[PDB]
């Protein structure tokens, strides 16, 4: 018989120093940390897109319900939750004629038409930013479905612009990076889903029972992208820094030339939460290899340590490098040649490709969430997806898979590593969910890497997450 261990929920913090395990409940009960006054939005799109956005804004000023209030908390209105004004009166419109959109989406080349459409939108956005008086917090880009259908890299149509990714979203977000304009992209079938139907009279996407969930997600994203703090972690210890490393394939040239990006998280020391990308993309020329050369590893670790020191005033007492790969001896020797003497560097690998499933012998409900199986002093399985008794349901549909956490390098305690990994699953500001299945250090770094891989002209990019997510 093998023995399992349980790990308790980490809890998150809200206004008035009140702790809760859910973000929806804590937002409906207490409210967010900071005090915004109101969101002034800029809307660039067609006329019908503008009307759709206005209707949606008018829709979320009132309570919106789900089918079940236990499985899914309801939405009591934007001003009831966030204590700020986001209404369809502080809107500036930048019209985009439909004839231009039709004209540019026909060139029979994905790269060229994608470049033309991104140029069309960002030209108006940039011109409005540079030479106008109205102040805009977030720019809402409404996109028709015909643009979304044909602009994927593997989309079939029934040189100068070839040095870009063939994806509209990533190229759009990368080409606006040097201007630092927070923007949110909406499809036209997302805000008005009742009108778009298939050839049977029914909506293609049915949000009838999950309208409140969509309102929660959209409102939280809009609030965060406008400079609002929705919540923060409540049990982050002092002197510990979390660093996530993610690799991507640059490609789009002769050299695959792998690239690496980082994300950093630590405590502000003012009881805040510092959580920002640490990225100047570091390159490896050899194909298929996901390890840093000594120079790049030294540069990355030096930059991260200097950032922590400048923010806090002292070097960290503990550095956890979470990664999806293993480390070699050259990598870690380069890492250790710049680390200060009185600092502990632990390198942890979080893997998902490891088959193991636990079945309850009687019921039709899966294993409890915070269960873990410790193979050895340096390895353990952890269930981040599973049944949550608070909401009377699980975070998946079939039998969930656990994460295989291995202390690859250094000397640490596996139980504390599991506790920190479970705590890190409660910071997905790009969503409004009970909890994530992966630590956010390895997810936002991936998002940053996939954003600053769609262009080659980016230099000294911004680090705030609101310019990528």
Partner 1 sequence: VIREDTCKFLLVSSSYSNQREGVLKELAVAAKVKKQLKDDKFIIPLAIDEQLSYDDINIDIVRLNAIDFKMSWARGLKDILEAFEKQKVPKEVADASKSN
Binding-site residues: 430, 468-469
In whole angstroms, the minimum distance from the beta carbon of 56 to Mg ion comes to: 15
Cα–Cα distance between 19 and 286 in angstroms, integer? 48
Could you say which of Mg ion, partner 1, DNA, none residue 79 binds, taking C-beta under 5 to 8 angstroms by partner kind?
A: partner 1
Cβ proximity to partner 1, 216 vs 468, nearer residue: 216
Binding part of the chain for partner 1, among 71-79, 99-107, 259-267, 445-453 by CB under 8 A, reads 71-79
Residue list 80-119, contact with partner 1 (CB under 8 A): 80, 83
Question: What token pair was written down for 102?
Answer: 């039709």
Nearest to 469 by CA among 452, 449, 444: 444
Cβ proximity to partner 1, 2 vs 16, nearer residue: 16
In whole angstroms, the minimum distance from the beta carbon of 363 to DNA comes to: 15
Instruction: Decide if 321 contacts 346 (C-beta within 8 A).
Output: yes
Binding mask 22-41 for partner 1 (x = CB under 8 A): -------xx-----------
Cα–Cα distance between 32 and 91 in angstroms, integer? 24
What is the C-alpha R_g of the chain? 23
Alpha helices for 131-263 (secondary structure H): 145-150, 168-175, 188-191, 211-225
Cβ proximity to Mg ion, 190 vs 430, nearer residue: 430
Could you say which of Mg ion, DNA, partner 1, none residue 221 binds, taking C-beta under 5 to 8 angstroms by partner kind?
A: Mg ion
Nearest to 147 by CA among 201, 189, 179: 189
Q: Is residue 269 within the footprint of partner 1 (CB under 8 A)?
A: no
**9, 79, 293, 318: which one binds partner 1 (CB under 8 A):** 79
Could you say which of partner 1, Mg ion, DNA, none residue 429 binds, taking C-beta under 5 to 8 angstroms by partner kind?
A: none
Instruction: Decide if 440 contacts 231 (C-beta within 8 A).
Output: no
Which residue is listed with tokens 């479905």? 145
Q: Is residue 63 within the footprint of partner 1 (CB under 8 A)?
A: yes
Q: Is residue 77 within the footprint of partner 1 (CB under 8 A)?
A: yes
Which residue is listed with tokens 């261990």? 5
Which residues of this protein are in contact with DNA, per CB under 7 A?
67-68, 71, 152-155, 205-206, 208-210, 246-249, 251, 290, 324-326, 349, 351, 353, 393, 397
**41, 264, 430, 441: which one binds Mg ion (CB under 5 A):** 430
DSSP sequence for 412-453: --HHHHHHHHHHGGG--TT---S--SS-THHHHHHHHHHHTT
Nearest to 300 by CA among 269, 332, 268: 332
Which residue is listed with tokens 């399985």? 381
In whole angstroms, the minimum distance from the beta carbon of 221 to Mg ion comes to: 4
Task: List residues near partner 1 by CB under 8 A.
Answer: 15-16, 18-20, 29-30, 61-63, 76-77, 79-80, 83
């Amino acid at each position: 018989m093998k023995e399992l261990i349980y790990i308790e929920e980490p809890k998150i913090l809200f206004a008035h120093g009140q702790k809760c395990t859910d973000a929806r409940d804590g937002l409906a009960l207490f409210g967010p940390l900071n005090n915004l006054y109101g969101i002034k939005s800029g809307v660039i799109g067609t006329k019908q897109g503008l009307k759709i956005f206005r209707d949606y804004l008018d829709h979320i000023q009132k309570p919106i319900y789900n089918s079940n209030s236990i499985t899914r908390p309801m939405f009591p209105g934007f001003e009831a939750v966030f204590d700020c004004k986001w209404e369809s009166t502080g809107i500036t419109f930048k019209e985009v004629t439909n004839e231009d959109i039709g004209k540019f989406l026909y060139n029979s080349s994905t790269h060229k038409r994608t470049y033309d459409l991104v140029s069309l939108f960002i030209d108006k956005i940039i011109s409005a930013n540079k030479n106008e008086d109205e102040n805009v917090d977030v720019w809402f880009v409404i996109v028709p479905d015909e643009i979304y259908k044909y602009c994927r890299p593997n989309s079939v149509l029934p040189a100068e612009t070839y040095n870009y990714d063939a994806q509209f979203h990533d190229q759009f977000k990368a080409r606006l990076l040097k201007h630092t304009i927070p923007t949110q992209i909406f499809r036209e079938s997302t805000l008005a889903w009742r009108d778009f139907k298939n050839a049977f009279g029914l909506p293609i996407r049915d949000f009838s029972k999950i309208e409140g969930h969509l309102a929660w997600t959209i409102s939280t994203a809009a609030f965060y992208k406008a400079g609002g703090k929705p919540w923060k972690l409540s049990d982050v210890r002092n002197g510990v820094c979390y660093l996530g490393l993610v690799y991507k394939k640059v490609e789009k040239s002769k050299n695959p030339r792998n690239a690496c990006c980082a994300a950093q998280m630590f405590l502000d020391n003012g009881d805040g939460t510092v959580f920002k990308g640490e990225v100047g993309p570091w390159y490896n020329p050899k194909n298929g290899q996901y390890h840093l050369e000594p120079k790049e590893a030294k540069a990355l670790l030096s930059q991260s340590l200097q950032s922590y020191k400048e923010q806090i005033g002292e070097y960290p007492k503990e550095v956890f490098i979470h990664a999806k790969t293993r480390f070699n001896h050259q990598e870690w020797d380069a890492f250790l040649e710049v680390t200060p003497k009185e600092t502990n560097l632990v390198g942890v690998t979080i893997s998902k490709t490891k088959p193991l499933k636990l079945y309850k012998t009687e019921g039709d409900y899966t294993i409890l969430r915070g269960n873990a199986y410790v193979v050895n002093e340096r390895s353990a399985f952890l269930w981040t997806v599973g049944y949550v008794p608070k909401i009377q349901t699980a975070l998946s549909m079939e039998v969930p898979n656990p994460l295989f956490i291995e202390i690859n390098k250094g000397e640490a305690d596996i139980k504390q590593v599991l506790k920190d990994i479970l705590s890190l699953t409660k910071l997905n500001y790009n969503a409004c969910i009970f909890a994530d299945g992966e630590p956010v250090t390895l997810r936002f770094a991936d998002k940053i890497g996939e954003i600053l891989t769609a262009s080659t002209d980016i230099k000294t990019p911004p680090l705030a997450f609101k310019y990528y997510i």
